[PDB]
């Protein structure tokens, strides 16, 4: 299991326990539920790039104690 560090806007450090097998689609939607907002409202930025639904931890280069940022999109959802 990989423990990613999600940096919240209020300095909240979220520890998302992911697995190097699942898709980031499941992760993106689950995080939205954790906050209580609809999917596509929050953009996940990794190294300046936005995490897509078909994205996988196998690509880009995700590891343990990795830093991922989450921001609210102008679309609102």
């Amino acid at each position: 299991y990989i423990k990613l560090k999600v940096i919240g806007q209020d300095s909240s450090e979220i520890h998302f326990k992911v697995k190097m097998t699942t898709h980031l689609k499941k992760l993106k939607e689950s995080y939205c539920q954790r906050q209580g907002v609809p999917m596509n409202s929050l953009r996940f930025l990794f190294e300046g790039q936005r995490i897509a639904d078909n994205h996988t931890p196998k690509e880009l280069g995700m590891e343990e104690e990795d830093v991922i940022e989450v921001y609210q999109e102008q679309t609102g959802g």
């Binding site: 979220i14 520890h15 998302f16 326990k17």
Partner: peptide
């Protein structure tokens, strides 16, 4: 200094 743990389920 705030840590929240979330667990994800993986589809076989």
């Amino acid at each position: 200094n705030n840590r929240d743990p979330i667990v994800i389920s993986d589809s076989p």
